[PDB]
C-alpha cells in the first residue's frame, strides 16, 4: 503493498496550491484523482514521486518512510511516473524509446528484452512506426509511446498523469484493456484524466479534489450523484 | 543505448562549439595580419602557414571549454523538454550521465594530449624556422629548474576530466521555472582556474615556489569541489 | 504595430541576456591568451601577477569593439533558437506579426548596442589602451583622430574610417542574414542545422568586409561610397530572404 | 467568404501522409475534421495556413489564390491558427500573453485594447491568474490562454487544432458557448478535437478523414450511423 501519502502540503508564493491531501492506494486496484484545473492533481503527483520537495507531507510504501529519498531512489522501489508535459526522447526511434528503459530491470536477458519491445508495440498498435523518429510523431501517437515506455519499466504503483490526453476514441478502449490486464497481475495505478467517462468506468475508487482539498471519495456510482461534485466538477446533468 | 544517446548529443554539440569558437578567435588573428602586412613592411608568404600553425597554442585553452560549454548546451536542452525526469523515473540514477559525461571526456583528453605534446612543440619548430627554450617532449631525463612544464603540460588533461564533472550538477535548473542562464557560474569558475593554475608558474615558478606542491593543491581543491557538489544527497 | 511594444520588449529582452553572455565568454577567454602571453616572457620585476595582469584588465574595452559583431551575431541566433524551438514564434507569425517585424525588433535592441560599442570604442578604448602601455613600461589610433588623417598623411587614402563610420549598418546586415534561416517547420530539421547554418552564412559576410573593402584599385571608385557596396548588396538580398 | 482547399497532398519519405483532401468552409458555420491518429488532420492544417509547403494543393479565399503566400501574409487576410504543441510565450504573464497580440489590429485605441484583455479574461475564468507567468501554468490552464490568445487576433476562418485537449468538463461547455457567440458574428472555425461528444454537438458538418482520404461527410446525426466510420473511428456502439 500500500502506497500511502498523508497530509501533504505545498505553497509557492504563499498561495498554498495543495492543502491537507491524503490518498492511499493498494496493490491490485486502480484509483482516480479528479478535479478542475485548480486543485493540483499534478503537484500532488510531484510530491509523491519527489520532483518538488514537500512541506508537511509523509509518504509511506506500506511500512517505510521514503519522504526524503530522491527521485531515482523511489523509482527502484516501485514508483513509476508518466508526466504530463510531452516527454519523449525526440531523437531516438520508437523502438529505441522502448528499448532504452529495458536496459534496466536486471532480470531480462537479451532474449526477453527483444520480445518485450516487439510485444509492447503490438498491444498499442504502433508497430508501423517502428523506426520513424521521436520528433516526427503526432499527438496521440506521441502519447501512446510515453504510456508504452512507462509500462516497460515493470513498476508497481504507477502514477499515470493524463494518459488519454487527446489519443483516440479507439486507442483508449485498447489502453483500458491492457491497464486492467496489468491490474490483475498486482499493480495499482492512479489515473487522473479529464474525460470522466473512460476514467470513471475503469476506476474502483475516486478522490475528487478541489482547490486544495478533498471534497468527495467513494464508489464511481457515488461520485456522480453528489451534488457538490456537480457544482465544481462534472459539468451539469451528467450520466 | 541511452549512454549512446547522451554521447551523440554532446559530441554533436562539442564539435559545433569548437569550430565556431576557433573561427572567431582566428579571424581576429587574421585581421591583425592586415595590421602587419602594409604598415609592418613585410610581405605575405607566411600567413598561409602561420594560420594553420597558430592553432595548437589556441586549441589547448578552448579544447577544455568546448567540453563543458557543450554539456550545458545539451543537458539543459534535455531538462526543459523533460527528457531526464523520465530517465530518473524508470530506473537509472544521476550516476549515468556522470558516466556518460566521462566517456567523451576521454575522447577530448586524448585529442587535448596529442595537441599538448606532439603538436605543441611541432608548431614552435615550424614557427621558429619560418617567420621567426622549453619545448621538448619528455622531461623525466633532465632536472632543470623550469618545472612549469610537466605540471602545466599535464594539467591541461586533468582540466578536461575535472571540468566535465563539475558541470553535471550545474545543469539541473529547469523543472518548470527559473532561468536557463546557468552558464555564468561555470564560466566564472573556469576563469578562476586559469588565473591561478596557469599563472602559478611565472610568479610562483622559476625559483619562487615549488610548482608541484602548489600546482596541485589548486588542482585538487578544485577537484574536491567537483565531487562534494556532485554528491549532494547524503550530506548530513 | 507600435513603436517598442510588448513583443519588442520580449524578443529584445530574450536575446539581450544572450548577447551579454556570449560577450562575457569571448572577452574573458581573450583575456586569458593575453594573460598567458604577457606573463610567459616576464623578464623584469615589474612583470608578475599584478602589473602584467593589470595590463589585461586595462585592455578589455579594446576587446569589446572587435568582439561585438561576433557576439551579437552569435547571441541573436542562440536567443531566437530557444523561441522557435518551443514553437512560440510560429504563433507570432500566425497573428499578423510578420517576419520582417521580428527582424525589426532585433534592430531596436542591437543597434543601440553597437552605438554603445562605438561610444566606448573611441572615447575610453584608445585612452585605456595607451594608459596600459605606461604601467607596463615605467622603467623598462582612434576614430576622431582619423578625421585628422583625411589629407595630412603626407584603398587607404580614405577607406579606414568609412568602414567603421557605418559599423551599425554593417552589423545589422549580419543579423538579417542570420535570422533568415531560423524560420521553418519543427518536425524534420532538428534546430541544430539552423543555428550553425545561420552562423556560417553570417560569417561569410564578415570576411567580405575586409576582403572586398581594399578593392578600390580597379577603377577609381570613391572609397566612401565604394565601402558601402558589400553591405548594401546583401541588404537587398536579405530583405528578399525573409519575404519570399 | 469561403475558405477553400482543393486536392492537397503531402509526402515525407515517399509515404504520402495526406492524399486527395478537399475541404471547404463558409463564414458563419463551424466544421469538424475528425479521424484517428493516422490521417493528418494537422498536416492538412499545416498546408492551409502554410507552415509546410504543399505538393499538389490549391488554397482559395473565395476568389483568390493564396497558395504561394507565406505564413504571415495569410494571417492578415483572415486565417487564424491555434497549434497543438503547447505554444505560450512562457515568460510573459497571462495578461501580457493576451496583450501581445492586441498590439496588432490597428483599429483599437488604448481604451478598447485594455477592456478587451480584461473582458477575455472573464469569459475564460482566468482572471485570478492575471500575472502569474507563462511557465508556471498548468495543463488546461495553459490551454485556456492559447485559445484566448487566438480569439484575440479577431480573424476569420480559425483553425482550432485540439481546443479541448485536457481542459475540464466545465470549461469546455464555457468555451463552446463563446465559440458560438462568435459564430453568430460571422466567423467559421474548424474544430478537430477527439472527444466526439463536445465537438459533434457543436459542429454543423464534419469531414471524417482516415489514413489519407475522406471517408465520410455530412450532418452530425449522419456521421454516427455510418458503419465504415464506426470501424476506423468512433470506437463501437457509440
Ligand atoms: C556559445 C557558442 C555557440 C554555441 C553554438 C551552439 C550550436 C549547437 C548546434 C548543434 C549543431 C548540430 O549540428 C550537427 O552538426 C553535425 C556536424 O557533424 C552534423 O553531422 C549534424 O547533421 C548536425 O546535426
Ligand atoms: N512553480 C509554480 N509557481 C507558481 N504557481 C504554480 C507553480 N506550479 C504550479 N502553480 C499553480 O498551481 C496550481 C495547480 O498546478 P497543478 O498542480 O499543475 O494543477 P493541475 O492539476 O496540473 N492543473 P491540471 O493538470 O489541468 O489538473 C495552478 O494554479 C498553477 O498556476
Ligand atoms: N516530418 C515528418 N516526417 C515523417 N513523418 C511525419 C512527419 N510529420 C508527420 N509525420 C507522420 O504523418 C502522420 C500524420 O501526422 P499528423 O499530421 O500530425 O497527424 P495527426 O492528425 O496530427 N495525428 P493526431 O494529431 O493525433 O490526429 C503520422 O504518422 C506522423 O508520424
From TrEMBL, chain B:
Transmembrane parts of this sequence: 15-38, 58-75, 96-118, 152-173, 180-200, 212-232
Protein name: Lipopolysaccharide export system permease protein LptF
Similarity section: Belongs to the LptF/LptG family.
GO biological process: lipopolysaccharide transport; transmembrane transport
Underlying gene: lptF
Keywords assigned: Cell inner membrane, Cell membrane, Membrane, Transmembrane, Transmembrane helix, Transport
Pfam family, one: LptF_LptG
Gene Ontology, cellular component aspect: ATP-binding cassette (ABC) transporter complex
Lineage: Bacteria, Pseudomonadati, Pseudomonadota, Gammaproteobacteria, Enterobacterales
NCBIfam families in alphabetical order: LptF_YjgP
Native organism: Escherichia coli
Subunit and partners: Component of the lipopolysaccharide transport and assembly complex. The LptBFG transporter is composed of two ATP-binding proteins (LptB) and two transmembrane proteins (LptF and LptG).
Annotated InterPro entries: LptF, LptG/LptF_permease
Known role: Part of the ABC transporter complex LptBFG involved in the translocation of lipopolysaccharide (LPS) from the inner membrane to the outer membrane.
Topology with respect to the bilayer: Multi-pass membrane protein
UniProt-annotated location(s): Cell inner membrane
Statement: the UniProt record of this protein carries the keyword 4Fe-4S: no
Amino acid at each position: 503493498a500500500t502506497l500511502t501519502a498523508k497530509n501533504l502540503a505545498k505553497a509557492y508564493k504563499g498561495r498554498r496550491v495543495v492543502e491537507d491531501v491524503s490518498l492511499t492506494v493498494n496493490s491490485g486496484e486502480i484509483v482516480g484523482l479528479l478535479g478542475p484545473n485548480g486543485a493540483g492533481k499534478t503537484t500532488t503527483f510531484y510530491m509523491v514521486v519527489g520532483i518538488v520537495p514537500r512541506d508537511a507531507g509523509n509518504i509511506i510504501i506500506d511500512d517505510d518512510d521514503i519522504s526524503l529519498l530522491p527521485l531515482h531512489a523511489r523509482a527502484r522501489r516501485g514508483i513509476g511516473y508518466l508526466p504530463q508535459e510531452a516527454s519523449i526522447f525526440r531523437r531516438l526511434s520508437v523502438y529505441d524509446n522502448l528499448m532504452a528503459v529495458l536496459q534496466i530491470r536486471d532480470d531480462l536477458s537479451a532474449e526477453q528484452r527483444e520480445d518485450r519491445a516487439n510485444e509492447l508495440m503490438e498491444e498499442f498498435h504502433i508497430e508501423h512506426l517502428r523506426d520513424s523518429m521521436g520528433q516526427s510523431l503526432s499527438g496521440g501517437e506521441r502519447r501512446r509511446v510515453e504510456i508504452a515506455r512507462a509500462l516497460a519499466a515493470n513498476p508497481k504503483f504507477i502514477l499515470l498523469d493524463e494518459p488519454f490526453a487527446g489519443v483516440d476514441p479507439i486507442s483508449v478502449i485498447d489502453i483500458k484493456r491492457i491497464i486492467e490486464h496489468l491490474r490483475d497481475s498486482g499493480l495499482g495505478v492512479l489515473i487522473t484524466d479529464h474525460n470522466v467517462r473512460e476514467t470513471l468506468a475503469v476506476c474502483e475508487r475516486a478522490y475528487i479534489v478541489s482547490q486544495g482539498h478533498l471534497i468527495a471519495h467513494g464508489t464511481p456510482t457515488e461520485i456522480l450523484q453528489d451534488e457538490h461534485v456537480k457544482r465544481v466538477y462534472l459539468g451539469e446533468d451528467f450520466r | 543505448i541511452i549512454i549512446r544517446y547522451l554521447v551523440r548529443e554532446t559530441l554533436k554539440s562539442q564539435l559545433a562549439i569548437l569550430f565556431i569558437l576557433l573561427l572567431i578567435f582566428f579571424c581576429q588573428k587574421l585581421v591583425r595580419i592586415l595590421g602587419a602586412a602594409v604598415d609592418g613592411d613585410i610581405p605575405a608568404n607566411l600567413v598561409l602557414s602561420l594560420l594553420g600553425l597558430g592553432v595548437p597554442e589556441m586549441a589547448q585553452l578552448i579544447l577544455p571549454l568546448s567540453l563543458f560549454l557543450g554539456l550545458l548546451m545539451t543537458l539543459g536542452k534535455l531538462y526543459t523538454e523533460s527528457e531526464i525526469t523520465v530517465m530518473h523515473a524508470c530506473g537509472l540514477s544521476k550516476a549515468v550521465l556522470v558516466k556518460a559525461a566521462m566517456i567523451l571526456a576521454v575522447f577530448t583528453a586524448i585529442v587535448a594530449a596529442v595537441n599538448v605534446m606532439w603538436a605543441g612543440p611541432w608548431s614552435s619548430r615550424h614557427q621558429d624556422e619560418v617567420l621567426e627554450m622549453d619545448m621538448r617532449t619528455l622531461w623525466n631525463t633532465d632536472t632543470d629548474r623550469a618545472r612549469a612544464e610537466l605540471n602545466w603540460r599535464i594539467t591541461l588533461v586533468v582540466t578536461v576530466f575535472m571540468m566535465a564533472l563539475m558541470v553535471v550538477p550545474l545543469s539541473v535548473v529547469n523543472p518548470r521555472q527559473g532561468r536557463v542562464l546557468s552558464m555564468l557560474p561555470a564560466m566564472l569558475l573556469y576563469l578562476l582556474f586559469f588565473l591561478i593554475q596557469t599563472s602559478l608558474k611565472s610568479n610562483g615558478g622559476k625559483g619562487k615556489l615549488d610548482p608541484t606542491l602548489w600546482m596541485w593543491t589548486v588542482n585538487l581543491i578544485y577537484l574536491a569541489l567537483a565531487i562534494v557538489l556532485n554528491l549532494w544527497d547524503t550530506v548530513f | 504595430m507600435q513603436p517598442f511594444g510588448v513583443l519588442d520588449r520580449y524578443i529584445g529582452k530574450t536575446i539581450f541576456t544572450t548577447i551579454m553572455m556570449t560577450l562575457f565568454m569571448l572577452v574573458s577567454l581573450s583575456g586569458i591568451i593575453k594573460f598567458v602571453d604577457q606573463l610567459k616572457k616576464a623578464g623584469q620585476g615589474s612583470y608578475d601577477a599584478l602589473g602584467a595582469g593589470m595590463y589585461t584588465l586595462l585592455s578589455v574595452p579594446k576587446d569589446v569593439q572587435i568582439f561585438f559583431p561576433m557576439a551579437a551575431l552569435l547571441g541573436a541566433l542562440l536567443g531566437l533558437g530557444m523561441l522557435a524551438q518551443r514553437s512560440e514564434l510560429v504563433v507570432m507569425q500566425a497573428s499578423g506579426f510578420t517576419r520582417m517585424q521580428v527582424a525589426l525588433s532585433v534592430m531596436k535592441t542591437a543597434i543601440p548596442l553597437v552605438l554603445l560599442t562605438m561610444a566606448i570604442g573611441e572615447w575610453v578604448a584608445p585612452q585605456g589602451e595607451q594608459m596600459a602601455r605606461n604601467y607596463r613600461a615605467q622603467a623598462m589610433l582612434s576614430i576622431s583622430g582619423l578625421h585628422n588623417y583625411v589629407k595630412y598623411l603626407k584603398g587607404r587614402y580614405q577607406l579606414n574610417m568609412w568602414s567603421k563610420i557605418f559599423q551599425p549598418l554593417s552589423v545589422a546586415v549580419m543579423m538579417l542574414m542570420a535570422l533568415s534561416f531560423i524560420f521553418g517547420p519543427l518536425r524534420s530539421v532538428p534546430m541544430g542545422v539552423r543555428v550553425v547554418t545561420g552562423i556560417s552564412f553570417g560569417f561569410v559576410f564578415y570576411v567580405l568586409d575586409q576582403i572586398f573593402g581594399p578593392l578600390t584599385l580597379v577603377y577609381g571608385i570613391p572609397p566612401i561610397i565604394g565601402a558601402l557596396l558589400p553591405s548594401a548588396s546583401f541588404f537587398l538580398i536579405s530583405l528578399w530572404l525573409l519575404m519570399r
